[PDB]
């Protein structure tokens, strides 16, 4: 949560990084990671979704936000009302002048009884659509490996809404709704995996092995580069004659 509304020109991921909330899997994890990194910001704007007839702000034992249970801060775990889970049919127009990135998900319970307990319907259904695109996810009820005390999962999906387009969320169960949207941007932002420390110094080029000078035209440090880096080459050395015979 310390990274809320953060912005970067280079997000550096550490090999020691770990997840400590509800176990989740992102179908096409690479695509979401890459587009979020290219966006360069986690600027999140909450929106007034009117989830009628359901319990908002669900949580789990695995995801301890404070003294007790919690959940992802940018997701809303909808749960049955007293004894009903209506067919949510909410909508959100994009009257703004920029693309909106909505991150949502679908819950995968471990057992049929768990599914019926969280959601009155024996089988769930999530549909998230725009004027052109659409996605529908059918929850799968089955036991996964024990992770942080849970055999269930959450499958994370994303939708991008252009200006003038409108989002529609229609669900009958197993909806991990969004709390808003991430303001997308276009620019120089990217992401990198590196264990190297960060220091107060100047460098136009960055690599997982650390910053390197860019005076020379070629480099043999790493093929992963950011900035005005020299072109990667397999040769360890290349002596150019700055003199005569």
């Amino acid at each position, epitope marked *: 949560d310390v990274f809320q509304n953060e912005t970067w020109d280079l997000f550096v991921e550490r090999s020691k990084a770990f997840s400590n909330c509800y176990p989740y899997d992102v179908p096409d994890y690479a695509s979401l990671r890459s587009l979020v990194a290219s966006s360069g910001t986690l600027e999140f704007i909450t929106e007034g979704f009117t989830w009628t007839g359901v319990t908002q702000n*669900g*949580g789990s034992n695995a995801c301890k936000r404070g003294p007790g249970s919690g959940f992802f801060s940018r997701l809303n775990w909808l749960t049955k009302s007293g*004894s009903t889970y209506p067919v949510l049919n909410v909508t959100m127009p994009n009257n703004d002048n920029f693309d909106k990135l909505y991150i949502w998900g679908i819950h995968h319970p471990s057992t049929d009884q768990e599914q019926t*307990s969280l959601y009155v319907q024996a089988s769930g259904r999530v549909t998230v659509s725009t004027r052109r695109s659409q996605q529908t996810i059918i929850p799968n009820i089955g036991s996964r490996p024990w992770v942080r005390g849970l055999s269930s999962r959450i499958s994370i999906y994303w939708t991008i809404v252009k200006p003038g387009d409108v989002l529609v969320i229609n669900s009958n169960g197993n909806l991990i709704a969004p709390r808003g949207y991430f303001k997308m941007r276009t620019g120089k932002s990217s992401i990198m995996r590196s264990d190297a420390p960060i220091d107060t110094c100047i460098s136009e080029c960055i690599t997982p092995n650390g910053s390197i000078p860019n005076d020379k035209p070629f480099q043999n440090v790493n093929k992963i580069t950011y900035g005005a880096c020299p072109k990667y080459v397999k040769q360890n050395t290349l002596k150019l004659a700055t003199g005569m015979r």
Partner: antibody
Amino acid sequence: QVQLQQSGAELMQPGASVKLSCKATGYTFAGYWIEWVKQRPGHGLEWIGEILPGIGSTNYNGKFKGKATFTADSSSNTAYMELSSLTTEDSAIYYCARSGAQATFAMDYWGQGTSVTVSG
Amino acid sequence: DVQMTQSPSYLAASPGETITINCRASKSISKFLAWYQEKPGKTNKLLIYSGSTLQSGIPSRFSGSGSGTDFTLTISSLEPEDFAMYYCQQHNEYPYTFGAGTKLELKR
């Protein structure tokens, strides 16, 4: 053969905290809601809250938001409720009850009721 | 928060007769009401759920009716064991609420 059996009676001083327990036998404890209800003379049954032990999803009544705190141990099929900062008004019987879609979330089985007496 | 009133708070009856017990909600709860029995010495028991569905194992002499804000439970041919305490509970709106309950006696 399905039942919920709770802890014995409790005698607490004001300002203390007590963890009532409820073991469940005869079914998959992780799948059904365990719902905690308060009863005392005149006021009658008063629903405290519920927990889905498998997920740990906890959900409280507003009047007991800070008073109660549910927990579950799936290995022993045991739910727990930690009543904190006890006062004389908390003296009451507390029931744990099984709930699920089988009975349309009406509590189809109940514990025997653990009594708590708060007094200095 | 759905408050309730279950009437009459006191019911006087004798074995063998048929009776009805009323429950009223502050606002609509559709069809979701349940009727429970409490007697000393053992666990509370679920009689009816969803207003009119009979719980398994319960004798058919218990039968519920109603909807919206008005509900009733008919207890027919009172056995001597049926003289216990009874509660009505909503499970439509989330904060489940119980009626104050009714006392059913015998040999009136």
